Design a binder for this molecule. Structure first.
Ligand SMILES: Nc1nc2c(ncn2[C@@H]2O[C@H](COP(=O)(O)OP(=O)(O)OP(=O)(O)O)[C@@H](O)[C@H]2O)c(=O)[nH]1
Ligand SMILES: [Mg+2]
Lengths: 241, 90, 96, 94, 240, 321, 268, 310, 103
RNA sequence: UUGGAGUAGGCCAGCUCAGACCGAACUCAUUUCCUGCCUUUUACCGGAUGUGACCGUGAGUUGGCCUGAAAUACUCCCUAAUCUUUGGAAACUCUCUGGAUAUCCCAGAUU
């Protein structure tokens, strides 16, 4: 059971402008299958079954897009995994998202290559603790050499708060370091036009997320929270500042 | 109190991007792609076919329409089949 | 015999043999504690015959029969005995 | 067909034999009366004073005469000595 | 105290949820605070192109054919009424692993079941048409990984899972219509350009030389399933 | 509605303990001729004596209890007394209680001069068994083993720590059947600190790489022993290289020899490094590394830049172009 | 469970306290007996997980609830020491009633469940009195139960203090093989004995470090007590069957032939 | 010995209740059967096909003493000794609602089938509840001073025939809440009261083992009694035996405590059948409503017998 | 009242007909499968009769889904209403009826 | 904002399901084989393979018990400052178009 209508999803397939084809790509264990789990638990009615689990399996991560027995045993994705979800924007309009979840181990970059061939954009999931790692660099290089548009997902902000236990100012500096490291790989791949492909939160192509707790925000959406709470703020100017 | 939004208003929000046909208090029917609709039902359109009640048929681009001066809108059956008509019990 | 007669036979014999299978199972595995919770009563209508020595008619009798609550810790009451098997059924004529 | 009123009305012919119990002492048949029915009929036979036009008020006086035929129950706030509680273990004086 | 603080913010839970475990409670409070993934949807809508916008880029980047044709126009405009073109680049095996559903992108047309198509290999040209197999699209699914939604048709600019077109595809295929109505030929998309090399070499032979043909079939299925795996037979008869 | 079976039904009640006491005292050793009609059942209950032994020994009191009362189900002969209880515990509380026993016992063993071990058997073979009523019934019990808790530091568990079923009358349990618990953060922290001698220090799940169940099972199927792990009878005693004589692959002149592959690698990648990997289990490959370190200084706040953390510099960030 | 704030209550025997000690890597610088103990405890853990089953105990009636439904069993609350004294008395009286019904009153069962002849036996008497495995296993189990209950009775009389009580319970559950002949009637109980020895090595080495000397005083008895409860769990179906068949022979006699004998090696 | 119905057998036995079956009723289309029994349950069967217990309705706190169907067979109404009526949706098998207000055991109930639907109930507190099947509260209640054991509704829809302890069939007008007139002649308590399908006569069975047919049409003499059928003795249980008319109205059946359903001819008066089959008192005897020769007998045997009249 | 069939009359005198789906606090009316009625009174002057019969032609047109502005509705007329049995313990078997049942 | 439908908590007992995690825990027996130790058996060694039992668990449901509470309440279903319900109205002429066509009338549009 899902929380939308599959006939409505087919009609959204019929209209080809309100559709986005994206691939979740990144390093090993940086939270791509967990991001897909966030979206799946938002769209699907499976929480009561996950609640009926008991013991250590009740502690187990969902990992909806890992279905191969190697994936369930080894605990990492080895195949690309597509889903088609009817997700909603801040204005409430339903869109169609065709998302391919890719592996993050440095051996299944063939799966990453096939998904990158199919998709129109790449959401790059980067752990805020480990930052830019080897497959992050590889995926960045391949994406910007194939000229695929790139957005950034900074994941594991709970690791910022609860593992490292750094104060909020140092958390800002950690986030700034990770974003500038991603942009540094962009620039070192295309010199002179990485600024044309610059990733930064004030532009709105950086998303801060915690996928184990199922939340994400942009600065524009957080300023929209301020707008809906206190009333009458100019959201784009507030996020820019 | 926290302000909720009406179902026809959010239906306009979901109808943004499609070919909507609306008509207005001067008896004027406009057709085209909606690009933004707000809570006070102010809309814009971009590929407008105009039929004015004086018999005036025309075509132009990028009009702004006031929600006080609009009479009604027409949207497709997939927007009938939209997810918000499934009442999620909370 | 036809299918209906074969299925009637199979039902009758499956019922009789199933009752014997339940008997054998309950003999092979005594049911830990030999008490039943479902200890409901049987009623018996009992029209009597006359008497030993009296031929006057007497009153119709309703009997409430319940199975007795036996102590679950008790072993069986009686030692078993070896009796020689009885004679066969009267042997048939030898039709040679 | 065997239970038609005509078939039940027609009797077996012929003169009687001049010369069918399943129990050796009578006929026993499995029956399905109600438990309340059995208990009430058993009580009607078994209690003393069966039948008897007798009202609840004179129930109360009969119980009164019986209750002072019974001995003294005691006070149940005196634990020991004379006057102590004996309650339902009080002897019917005879 | 938690009820007081979250009631100040306007966040409300059931009291059992208030006394719940710290991790489940933290997830519930985060759901009441942040809400669903509308921020992600806004980011992707704003900063990632539609198929209607990215079709021209993907055509000029990965199409070997001439770009001034009507089929090129139909793929550029993502027309669902045009000829069927599906760029298959992945193969997901079935539940019993007896076959390989071909996952790809519908570029133009509508991929619908029971449709006669030409599956084109990576080495299909006009003169050399050995890498072309006529087949029939038999099953059409929207893939959801854990399950498949069978449909009557997947339009252009989309992702499709095709059953029936399986055998001829080794790594990457272009599944086109049997005959285009403009009398125009079919061209394939470019192969995948992977960004690492397969450098680790392992020799296989079977324990049963009678069962060696099963190794051949399994090696074919392996070569289908893993894009960067490469299988050879070295001239001493040793499979690599 | 009150006679929906023909009779008024009521719940089975508990009897007085003096009733069971009188029954066992009267039957004694079953020596008087009055009790023959009981003799067959008494000896018959011998069949059920193993349940009585298990129920008693699992409901035995803990070292911090002087005495414990248990519900018992008894036969009216006096033949079989069955402890009708399950010793249900809150697992954090039980951990803290036995960890406090560990610490208290160690302190007492360091402080006692001579430990006189008590004799076994405690009573003589021909000495008749003791009596509840004349030897134990109202006798003052000695002090059980109990930690001296802290009125301030162990304040959160102070009132209830050594109770038999702690918090059974409070809203921290579901009810007297003692089946579900909920504890506060101060209580949980105090129980964790009291259970410190018996809690695992391990935080990272990467600690058990090649030292967990799937690796042990793979090593068992491969007939190899991991370092520190168990060793079993072989799963397959069928393959010898002399049986795998010089057909095609065993050519030492064909195999390039680098430094050797170890048993741990053979287990970690069982399908690559083994020719016949039957019954092997694919173990979890890795977890993200835990960057949490436990703070030693107790005056430090929750959020602080630790000295163990590498610092972030402005020129380490450095937006270049 | 310390990352939780709510939960379900578990059995006191189902809490292992030191399982993580042998599940983690052994600490450095241990004796060879301690290292071997760690490996044997791992082997038991792996074999439990490997042969993990999944039955269907549905037709299951609870023995104690069925007995409670009867009128012959009543319910009350007493002290555990009173219940243990009753269980030991009842077991003694049962074995003594069996001995006396079989007319073996030249055998004396003492109150510590030792069975001895009171005189010199003839060959005929030694034959009629050779008891079997069901009787002797039940007698040794009741002997161990008596030892444990007697330790508690000594503490409640005041002859020993609580530290001695805990130490004696731990000694008893570690020295079942020296205080009984329970292994002599069920030789797989040596698996249980070896398990308790492995736990003794682990606990002893981690407990007697530094200022704590070597000798008696260790009352950390929960792991060994666990072991003997799980042994009881397995031994109940077997002994209840065996003792029930002992009682079948005693009360209705032996059926000698009739169920056919197999063709064994001596009969081929 | 011919075949006169589309059944699997000329007689079938339906068992599965774990108590005395006090009522059993047919669908208005005569294809489903609802049986209410002292195990506090209602069991729902399909007569055709082969036979299938397709439903169980639970929720009553005491014995199901009466039940009825709606006009079209989607709502089932039932009166029970938990002092309640209840209405059940049979598409979901769920209790719509309970009708509360009776203070003693509700012995009988009837449902008004034509015009607009109502519920009538007769109960030992001496009351006749008039219930709308939309509100849990009673529209009206007639207050007698004697317990009431059988109720029936006139085809006009505004007279109620009620009999109870007082051995008199009292005909009441609803809108006046008042007794029009009392048919007299029974000597023990009336157990069933049922109008004929054409509507001009009334079957009443009492505990004096006499099933009397009375006139109902307004023009009738002072003695309104048509006939006194005999042949069904009350046994030793004081049960409320429920008879019925045939669909064509020529036959008239009751149950009898010797385990026998007795059928007479309503026009003539001769004992047509004395069908056996039950080991307790037969509490209910119902002709099929679709004109079939199917007879249904429900007894205190925890079973019922569904046969054809060949 | 949701998902009933409705006829809504609008201030110039129009009628919008069909299946309604939802509403709001402003009673904005969303309504599906709509066909519209105009009551144009046309002067169909017959060439043979001098009486100009001003016939109220109710012309109709289908449109789809409406979103009626809430400051425009006058009248709303309702037209038409909107458009778990576990198998039990029972067994059924053929059986005979008895021996005789004498009268 | 409402009518419709609901009634507590604790405990005890039954019934039906549940393991792929009923159980963050762990025993026993036994089939068919392999190894070991072995004068025969039992009692054993330890691997495979299935098959039973025992100590426990959860959910639903039904009945009972204990202490309350009592038209209270809770629980569900459902629900006049501009920009929208607090108004530029109301009325009808003039002009233009169409039908009628000599006009009246009426429709649409405009002031
Ligand atoms: N602290 C924290 N851990 C997370 C979060 N999301 C996921 N994890 C953990 O990260 C680990 C790996 O995440 P995965 O779900 O496997 O994500 P992945 O990036 O798809 O991994 P690969 O497919 O191998 O590349 C899991 O064990 C999760 O528990 C998060 O938001 N915060
Ligand atoms: Mg993944």
């Amino acid at each position: 059971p899902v929380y939308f209508d599959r006939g409505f999803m087919t009609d959204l397939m019929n209209f080809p402008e309100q559709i986005r084809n994206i691939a979740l790509a990144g390093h090993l264990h940086h939270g791509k299958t967990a991001f897909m789990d966030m979206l799946v638990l938002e769209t699907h009615a499976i929480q009561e079954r996950l609640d009926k689990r008991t013991g250590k399996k009740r502690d187990e991560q969902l990992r909806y897009t890992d279905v191969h027995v190697i994936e369930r045993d080894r605990g990492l994705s080895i195949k690309a995994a597509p889903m088609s979800l009817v997700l909603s924007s801040t204005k409430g309009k339903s869109h169609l998202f065709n998302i391919i979840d890719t592996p993050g181990h440095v051996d299944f970059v063939d799966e990453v290559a096939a998904a990158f061939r199919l998709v129109d954009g790449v959401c790059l999931v980067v752990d805020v603790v480990e930052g830019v790692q080897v497959n992050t660099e590889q995926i960045i290089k391949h994406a910007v050499l194939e000229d695929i548009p790139l957005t950034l997902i900074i994941n594991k902000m709970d690791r910022l708060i609860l593992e490292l236990k750094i104060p909020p100012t140092d958390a800002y500096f950690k986030l700034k370091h990770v974003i500038e490291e991603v942009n540094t790989v962009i620039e070192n791949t295309i010199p002179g036009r990485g600024e044309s492909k610059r990733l930064s939160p004030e532009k709105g192509n950086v998303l801060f997320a915690c996928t184990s707790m199922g939340w994400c925000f942009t600065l524009q959406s957080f300023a929209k929270m301020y707008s809906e709470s206190y009333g009458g703020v100019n959201v784009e100017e507030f996020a820019r500042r | 109190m926290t302000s909720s939004i009406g179902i026809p208003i959010k239906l306009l929000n979901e109808a943004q991007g499609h070919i909507v046909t609306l008509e207005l208090t001067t008896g004027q029917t406009y057709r085209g792609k909606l690009i933004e609709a707000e809570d006070n039902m102010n809309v814009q359109l971009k590929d407008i076919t105009v039929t004015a009640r004086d018999g005036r048929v025309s075509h132009l681009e990028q009009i702004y329409i006031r929600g006080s001066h609009v009479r009604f809108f027409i949207v497709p059956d997939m927007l009938r089949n939209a997810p918000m008509f499934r009442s999620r019990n909370v | 015999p036809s299918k209906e007669e074969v299925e009637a036979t199979a039902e009758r014999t499956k019922n009789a043999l199933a009752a014997l299978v339940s008997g054998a199972l309950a003999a092979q595995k005594p049911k830990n504690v030999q008490v039943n919770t479902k200890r409901e009563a049987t009623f018996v209508k009992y029209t009597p015959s006359a008497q030993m020595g009296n031929n006057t008619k007497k009153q119709e009798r309703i009997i409430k029969i319940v199975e007795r609550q036996r102590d679950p810790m008790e072993p069986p009451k009686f030692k078993h005995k070896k009796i020689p098997r009885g004679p066969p059924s009267p042997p048939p004529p030898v039709m040679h | 067909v065997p239970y038609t009123g005509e078939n039940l009305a027609r009797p077996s012919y012929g003169p009687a034999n001049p010369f069918k119990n399943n129990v050796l002492t009578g006929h026993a048949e499995e029956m399905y009366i109600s438990e309340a029915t059995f208990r009430a009929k058993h009580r009607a036979v078994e209690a003393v004073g069966g039948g008897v036009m007798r009202s609840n008020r004179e129930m109360k006086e009969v119980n009164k005469r019986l209750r002072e035929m019974r001995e003294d129950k005691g006070s149940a706030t005196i634990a020991d000595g004379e006057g102590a509680y004996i309650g339902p273990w009080a002897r019917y004086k005879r | 105290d938690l009820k007081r603080t979250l009631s100040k913010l306007g966040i409300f839970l059931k009291p059992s949820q208030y006394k719940a475990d710290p991790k489940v409670l933290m997830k519930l409070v985060c759901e009441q605070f942040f809400g669903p993934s509308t921020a992600f949807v806004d980011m992707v809508i704003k900063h990632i192109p539609s198929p209607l916008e990215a079709a021209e880029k993907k055509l000029e980047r990965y199409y070997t054919g001439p770009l001034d044709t009507k089929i090129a126009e139909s793929m550029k405009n993502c027309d669902q009424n045009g000829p069927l073109v599906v760029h298959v680049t992945k193969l997901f095996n079935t539940i019993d692993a007896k076959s390989f559903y071909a996952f790809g992108r519908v570029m133009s047309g509508i991929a619908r079941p029971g449709a006669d198509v030409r599956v084109l290999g990576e080495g299909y040209t006009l003169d050399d048409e050995e890498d072309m197999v006529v087949s029939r699209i038999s099953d059409v699914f929207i893939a959801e990984t854990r399950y498949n939604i069978p449909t009557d048709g997947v339009p252009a600019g989309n992702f499709v899972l095709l059953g029936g077109v399986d055998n001829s595809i080794v790594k990457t295929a272009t599944i086109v219509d049997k005959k285009f109505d403009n009398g125009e030929d079919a061209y394939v998309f470019k192969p995948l350009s992977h960004f690492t090399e397969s450098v680790l070499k392992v020799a296989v032979e079977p324990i049963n030389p009678s069962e060696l043909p099963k190794m051949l079939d399994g090696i074919r299925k392996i070569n289908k399933s893993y894009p960067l795996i490469t299988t050879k037979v070295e001239e001493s008869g040793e499979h690599i | 509605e009150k006679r929906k079976g023909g009779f008024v039904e009521t719940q089975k009640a508990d009897m007085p303990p003096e009733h069971l006491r009188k029954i066992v005292k009267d039957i004694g050793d079953v020596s008087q001729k009055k009790y023959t009609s009981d003799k067959r059942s008494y000896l018959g209950a011998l069949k059920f004596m193993p349940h009585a032994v298990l129920k008693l020994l699992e409901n035995m009191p803990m070292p911090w209890e002087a005495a414990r009362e248990v519900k018992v189900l008894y036969h009216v002969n006096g033949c079989l007394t069955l402890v009708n209880e399950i010793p249900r515990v809150i697992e954090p509380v039980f951990f803290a209680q036995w960890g406090s026993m560990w610490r208290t016992m160690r302190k007492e063993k360091s402080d006692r001069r001579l430990f006189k071990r008590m004799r076994f058997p405690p009573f003589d073979d021909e000495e008749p068994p003791l009596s509840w009523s004349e030897n134990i019934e109202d006798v003052e019990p000695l002090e059980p083993i109990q930690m001296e808790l802290d009125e301030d530091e162990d304040a959160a568990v102070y009132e209830w720590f050594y109770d038999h079923q702690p918090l059974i009358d409070t809203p921290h349990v579901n009810g007297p059947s003692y089946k579900r618990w909920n504890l506060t953060l101060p209580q949980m922290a105090n129980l964790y600190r009291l259970s410190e001698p018996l809690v695992s220090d391990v935080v990272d799940p990467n600690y058990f790489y090649l030292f967990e169940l799937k690796s042990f099972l793979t090593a068992k199927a491969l007939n190899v022993a991991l370092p520190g792990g168990p060793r079993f009878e072989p799963l397959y005693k069928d393959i010898d290289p002399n049986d795998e004589d010089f057909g095609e692959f065993n050519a030492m002149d064909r195999i390039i020899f680098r430094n050797p592959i170890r048993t741990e690698t053979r287990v970690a990648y069982p399908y690559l490094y083994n020719s016949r990997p039957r019954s092997v289990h694919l173990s979890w490959h890795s977890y993200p590394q835990i960057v949490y370190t436990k703070t030693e200084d107790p005056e430090l706040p929750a959020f602080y830049f630790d000295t163990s953390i590498n610092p972030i510099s402005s020129r380490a960030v450095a937006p270049k172009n | 469970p310390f990352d939780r704030r709510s939960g379900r209550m578990v059995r006191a025997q189902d809490v292992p306290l030191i399982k993580h000690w042998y599940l983690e890597h052994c600490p450095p610088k241990q004796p060879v007996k301690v290292r071997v103990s760690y490996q044997k405890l791992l082997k038991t853990y792996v074999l439990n997980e490997l042969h993990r089953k999944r039955p269907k105990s549905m037709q299951k009636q609870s023995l104690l609830r069925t007995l409670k439904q009867t009128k012959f069993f009543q319910q009350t609350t007493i002290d555990w020491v009173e219940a243990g004294l009753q269980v030991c008395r009842q077991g003694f009286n049962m074995l003594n009633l069996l001995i006396h019904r079989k007319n073996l009153t030249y055998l004396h069962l003492d109150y510590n469940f030792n069975l001895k002849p009171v005189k010199t036996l003839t060959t005929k008497e030694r034959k009629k009195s050779r008891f079997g495995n069901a009787f002797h296993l039940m007698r040794e189990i009741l002997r161990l139960t008596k030892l444990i209950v007697d330790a508690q009775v000594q503490y409640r009389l005041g002859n020993i203090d609580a530290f001695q009580l805990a130490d004696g319970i731990h000694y008893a559950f570690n020295h079942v093989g020296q205080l009984t002949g329970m292994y002599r009637y069920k030789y797989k109980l040596m698996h249980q004995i070896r398990s308790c020895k492995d736990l003794k090595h682990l606990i002893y080495y981690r407990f007697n470090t530094g200022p704590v000397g070597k000798g008696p005083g260790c009352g950390f008895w929960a792991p060994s007590w666990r072991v003997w409860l799980f042994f009881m769990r397995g031994i109940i179906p077997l002994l209840e069957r065996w003792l029930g068949n002992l009682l079948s022979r005693q009360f209705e006699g032996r059926h000698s032939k009739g169920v056919a004998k197999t063709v064994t090696k001596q009969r081929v | 010995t011919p075949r006169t119905s589309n059944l699997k057998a000329p007689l079938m036995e339906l068992s599965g209740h774990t108590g005395e079956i006090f009522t059993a009723k047919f669908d208005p289309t005569g294809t489903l059967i609802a049986s209410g029994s002292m195990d506090r349950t209602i069991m729902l069967w399909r007569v055709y096909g082969d036979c299938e217990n397709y439903g169980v309705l639970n929720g009553h706190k005491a014995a199901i003493l009466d039940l009825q169907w709606s006009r079209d067979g989607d709502i089932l109404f039932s009166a029970s000794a938990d002092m309640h009526l209840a209405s059940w949706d049979l598409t979901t098998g769920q209790r719509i609602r309970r009708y509360i207000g009776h203070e003693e055991i509700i012995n009988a109930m009837d449902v008004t089938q034509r015009g607009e639907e109502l519920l009538i109930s007769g109960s030992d507190d001496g009351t006749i509840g008039i219930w709308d099947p939309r509100t849990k509260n009673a529209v009206d209640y007639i207050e007698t001073d004697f317990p009431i054991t059988a109720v029936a509704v006139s085809e006009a829809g505004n007279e109620i025939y009620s009999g109870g302890i007082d051995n008199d069939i009292k005909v009441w007008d609803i809108r006046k809440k008042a007794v029009v007139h009392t048919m007299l002649g029974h000597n023990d308590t009336i157990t069933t009261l049922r109008v004929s399908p054409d509507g001009q006569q009334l079957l009443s069975y009492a505990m004096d083992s006499t099933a009397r047919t009375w006139d109902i049409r307004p023009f009738a003499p002072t003695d309104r009694h048509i006939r006194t059928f005999d042949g069904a003795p009350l046994g030793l249980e004081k049960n409320l035996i429920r008879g019925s008319w045939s669909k064509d109205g020529k036959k008239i059946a009751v149950g009898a405590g010797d385990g026998t359903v007795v059928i007479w001819g309503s026009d003539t008066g001769k004992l047509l059948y004395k069908l056996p089959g039950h080991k307790g008192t037969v509490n209910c005897a119902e002709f099929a409503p679709d004109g079939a020769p199917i007879i249904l007998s429900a007894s205190s045997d925890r079973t019922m017998l569904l046969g054809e009249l060949i | 009242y949701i998902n009933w069939r409705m006829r809504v009359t609008l201030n110039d005198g129009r009628q919008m007909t069909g299946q309604m789906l939802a509403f709001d606090k402003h009673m904005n009316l969303v309504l599906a499968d709509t066909e519209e009625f105009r009551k144009t009174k046309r002067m169909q002057a017959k060439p043979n009769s001098s009486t100009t019969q001003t016939l109220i032609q109710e012309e109709k047109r289908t449109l789809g889904l409406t979103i009626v502005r809430g400051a425009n509705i006058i009248a709303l007329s309702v037209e038409s209403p909107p458009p778990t049995l576990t198998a039990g313990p029972g067994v059924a078997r053929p059986a005979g009826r008895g021996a005789a049942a004498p009268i």
